[PDB]
Amino acid sequence: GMRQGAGLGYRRDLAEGFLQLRNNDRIQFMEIAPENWIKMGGFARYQFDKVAEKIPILIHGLSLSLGGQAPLDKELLSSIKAMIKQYNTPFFSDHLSFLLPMPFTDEAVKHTAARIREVQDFLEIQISVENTSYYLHSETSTMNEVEFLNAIVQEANCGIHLDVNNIYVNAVNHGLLDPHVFIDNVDLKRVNYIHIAGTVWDLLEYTYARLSHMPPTLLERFPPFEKLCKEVDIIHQLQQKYVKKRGLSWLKI
Numbered sequence: 070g071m072r073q074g075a076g077l078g079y080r081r082d083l084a085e086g087f088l089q090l091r092n093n094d095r096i097q098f099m100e101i102a103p104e105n106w107i108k109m110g111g112f113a114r115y116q117f118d119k120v121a122e123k124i125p126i127l128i129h130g131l132s133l134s135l136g137g138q139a140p141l142d143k144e145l146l147s148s149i150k151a152m153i154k155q156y157n158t159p160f161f162s163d164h165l166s167f168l169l170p171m172p173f174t175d176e177a178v179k180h181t182a183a184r185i186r187e188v189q190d191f192l193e194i195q196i197s198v199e200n201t202s203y204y205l206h207s208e209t210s211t212m213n214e215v216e217f218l219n220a221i222v223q224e225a226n227c228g229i230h231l232d233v234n235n236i237y238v239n240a241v242n243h244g245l246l247d248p249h250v251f252i253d254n255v256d257l258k259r260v261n262y263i264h265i266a267g268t269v270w271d272l273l274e275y276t277y278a279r280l281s282h283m284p285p286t287l288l289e290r291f292p293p294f295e296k297l298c299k300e301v302d303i304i305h306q307l308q309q310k311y312v313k314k315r316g317l318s319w320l321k322i
């Protein structure tokens with residue numbers, strides 16, 4: 070325990086800056102993918118484990134493919150459960166995929182929701198689903214992106230890991246959903262984790278003005294460590310502006 074506030078993602082090449090952090094007052098938590106942890110060497114893992122003595126961890130995975138057709142990877146799920154136990158961190162988020170369009174249909178909602186309920190049963194925790202950029206919008210879609218997300222997470226009864234940039238990117242690429250309409254309609258009571266990497270900064274403020282609580286917010290990004298820490302201080306200063314002005318509580322994971 071315990072994750073709250075503003076954090077930074079772990080990379081083997083930032084290990085020297087992470088290992089010099091004397092506490093988690095500034096970098097309040099870090100993020101790691103299981104796909105990278107699993108394939109760490111002995112010394113890379115040592116450095117990581119040594120940083121995890123001071124800086125708590127959230128697990129955000131790349132490859133579980135929650136809306137995919139291939140059966141769920143039990144070898145991967147087992148490493149996720151092992152990490153949750155090892156680092157004492159009862160959180161997990163991943164993505165829907167990764168050519169073809171991602172159709173926002175009820176058939177895909179029911180399919181994805183059902184797999185998320187299986188992942189939840191195995192891990193014995195509730196997971197969060199991250200909104201991602203998609204390349205091709207399906208002609209067959211019966212709903213828009215925020216409807217789709219909302220529907221999946223309400224039918225799986227899981228959280229939302231909200232990525233601000235991915236909202237902006239789907240608005241730029243497709244022109245289908247105003248990022249302001251997105252945030253106004255997202256099930257914000259379910260957002261327990263946020264990612265941010267100008268107009269996008271303002272979408273963070275727009276979200277912060279509307280959430281029910283203040284979740285952990287990670288700077289997602291190759292610049293030098295202390296620059297990355299100054300960017301994290303700004304996310305945090307922005308969090309405190311909104312916790313103060315709106316009387317919010319900090320969500321602690």
Ligand SMILES: C[As](C)(=O)[O-]
Pocket residue numbers: 164199201202232235264289
């Ligand atoms: C780096 As992403 C598209 O999973 O927020």
Ligand SMILES: [Fe+3]
Pocket residue numbers: 129164199
């Ligand atoms: Fe992601």
Ligand SMILES: [Fe+3]
Pocket residue numbers: 199232264289
């Ligand atoms: Fe992200």
